Amino acid sequence: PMDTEEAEELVRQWENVKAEALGPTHQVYSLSEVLDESMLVQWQTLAQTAEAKSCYWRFVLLHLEVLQAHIFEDGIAGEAAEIEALLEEAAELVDESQPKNAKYYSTYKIRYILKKQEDGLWKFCQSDIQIQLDVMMARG
Amino acid sequence: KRPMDTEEAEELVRQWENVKAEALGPTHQVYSLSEVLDESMLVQWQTLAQTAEAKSCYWRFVLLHLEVLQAHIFEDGIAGEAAEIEALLEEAAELVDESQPKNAKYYSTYKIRYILKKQEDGLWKFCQSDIQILDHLDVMMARG
Amino acid sequence: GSHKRPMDTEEAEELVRQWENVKAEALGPTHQVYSLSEVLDESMLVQWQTLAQTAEAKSCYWRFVLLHLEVLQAHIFEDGIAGEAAEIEALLEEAAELVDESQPKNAKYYSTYKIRYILKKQEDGLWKFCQSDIQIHLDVMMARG
Amino acid sequence: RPMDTEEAEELVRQWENVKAEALGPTHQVYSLSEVLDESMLVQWQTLAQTAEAKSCYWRFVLLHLEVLQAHIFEDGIAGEAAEIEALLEEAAELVDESQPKNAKYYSTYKIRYILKKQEDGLWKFCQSDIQLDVMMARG
Numbered sequence A: 001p002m003d004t005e006e007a008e009e010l011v012r013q014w015e016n017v018k019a020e021a022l023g024p025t026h027q028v029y030s031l032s033e034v035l036d037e038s039m040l041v042q043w044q045t046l047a048q049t050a051e052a053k054s055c056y057w058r059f060v061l062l063h064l065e066v067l068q069a070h071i072f073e074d075g076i077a078g079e080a081a082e083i084e085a086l087l088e089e090a091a092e093l094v095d096e097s098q099p100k101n102a103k104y105y106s107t108y109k110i111r112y113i114l115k116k117q118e119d120g121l122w123k124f125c126q127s128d129i130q131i132q133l134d135v136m137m138a139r140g
Numbered sequence B: 001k002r003p004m005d006t007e008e009a010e011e012l013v014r015q016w017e018n019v020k021a022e023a024l025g026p027t028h029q030v031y032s033l034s035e036v037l038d039e040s041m042l043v044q045w046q047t048l049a050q051t052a053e054a055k056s057c058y059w060r061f062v063l064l065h066l067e068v069l070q071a072h073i074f075e076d077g078i079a080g081e082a083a084e085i086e087a088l089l090e091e092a093a094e095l096v097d098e099s100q101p102k103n104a105k106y107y108s109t110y111k112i113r114y115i116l117k118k119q120e121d122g123l124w125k126f127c128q129s130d131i132q133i134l135d136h137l138d139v140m141m142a143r144g
Numbered sequence C: 001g002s003h004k005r006p007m008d009t010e011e012a013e014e015l016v017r018q019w020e021n022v023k024a025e026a027l028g029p030t031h032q033v034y035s036l037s038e039v040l041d042e043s044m045l046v047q048w049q050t051l052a053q054t055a056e057a058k059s060c061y062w063r064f065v066l067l068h069l070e071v072l073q074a075h076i077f078e079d080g081i082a083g084e085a086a087e088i089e090a091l092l093e094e095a096a097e098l099v100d101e102s103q104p105k106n107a108k109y110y111s112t113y114k115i116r117y118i119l120k121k122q123e124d125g126l127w128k129f130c131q132s133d134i135q136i137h138l139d140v141m142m143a144r145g
Numbered sequence D: 001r002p003m004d005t006e007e008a009e010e011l012v013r014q015w016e017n018v019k020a021e022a023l024g025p026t027h028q029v030y031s032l033s034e035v036l037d038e039s040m041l042v043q044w045q046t047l048a049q050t051a052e053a054k055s056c057y058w059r060f061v062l063l064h065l066e067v068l069q070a071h072i073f074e075d076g077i078a079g080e081a082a083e084i085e086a087l088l089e090e091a092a093e094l095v096d097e098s099q100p101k102n103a104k105y106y107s108t109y110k111i112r113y114i115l116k117k118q119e120d121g122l123w124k125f126c127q128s129d130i131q132l133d134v135m136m137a138r139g
Helices: A004-021 A030-034 A037-052 B006-024 B039-054 C009-027 C034-039 C042-057 D005-023 D030-035 D039-053
Strands: A056-072 A080-094 A104-115 A123-129 B061-072 B082-094 B105-118 B124-131 C061-075 C087-099 C107-121 C127-135 D057-073 D080-095 D103-118 D122-130
Touching (some): A004 A030, A004 A056, A004 A080, A004 C009, A030 A037, A037 A056, A037 A123, A056 B105, B006 B039, B006 B061, B006 B082, B006 B124, B039 B124, C009 C034, C009 C042, C009 C061, C009 C107, C034 C042, C061 D080, C061 D103, C087 D057, C107 D057, D005 D039, D005 D057, D005 D103, D030 D039
Antiparallel strands (some): A104 A123, B082 B105, C061 C087, C087 C107, D057 D080, D103 D122
């Protein structure tokens, strides 16, 4: 059981942090804010990979909706939360080698697992998009 | 009743739509407007880019699809060669501001006509455009 | 400028509420003094550590009900390296009852008040409240913020 | 016929304390039987039984307890009754791990307590007139 307006502002904080990382700002450490554990690693590489090929993403989040926000704590150690977020976004990879070819428009739901830092920061842990280089790589 | 290359005309706008991004976006490159822009349309988007950059707000948009409806090269008076591109633009944007944790966004499809002036080097730049159908920046400031 | 940007109000409220949960644990009957070190350090710690240590040895505890908390302002400063600073002012509306055996009745309070917190990132990125400044035996007012 | 203000205050100060333990995590429904009778009983036993079965518990902080005019007149024939009017300024929080948030409140309110002296040395609160789960724990 979780506050959805907290969930909608926690992921919108993330999607905006994803954009700040993947993009011409090229801030990888921005991940360290809201990202941790498994998810930070892949997006740390991905933000640094696009920074390796000198490519960057332009993100626009059209709308998000939290379908189910729930809190569970497993064992004695850690607090965690699952957030199912219906996410409709579009992004284009601007590349120097193959300019302007890139684009995508996705409308999808995604399930986020995140840990509560002792600070209560609610950094993101891992996620997978539900099915029900590449420019579709950041659909998170 | 005059030609324009729809493969060229689309490229001018595809190269332009990226220029609006790099200028309004977090890189905030205002000089890059001067690359593809000229005359009134340069001053308008110079004002917007520099305005949003002074206010510490940066624009974000993805251009979904570009269609060229009509493209003509008329030279009008002897002064210079000109072009009229009617382009159907499908794009969405959210101006990213630190002030609000929620970024206001738009998704719009519209047809916007451009006029251009071929320079001495023979490169087409955008002097003026109209979209038929120190202040807060509306989400629709960047359209086209 | 000079690396000053607003913190997320969500980052703030869910961050602050963590301190209030710490204060209730440290100054309540559970007397978690270790809990103080979680979200506190440097100045604010030693102040509140000594209090929750005092309330432990004097066997007095604080009962907290915290009405709606609001974040008035949240900002991120820069320190040293590029990160690791912040100043956030929240409006705290709470009722605290100090249970002290010795005194005849537990004295409550009801105070709506604005307080300034200072928060740092320490080595690995994590935030801990460094100091607290309220703007306008044992007492019930010892516990505020 | 006005009550000793001490005689009245201890009656309510007890009830407020009885009310806190009943709706708290200790979830003592029996405590309502001590200091209540009739409507105060039925309404508050169902409520405490409600929160007990829903695993909800209230939290309470009573800031200031005050007595307005507290008067006594005999109940019909042998029984005796009393009116105690009290200003209650209290804060409370209903904690549900279910639901996103606990619902706090702070309410300063007048509530008329109609009591009867039980036959043997005892007083019971028999009525309250104030002029799922909500913050309905008041008075």
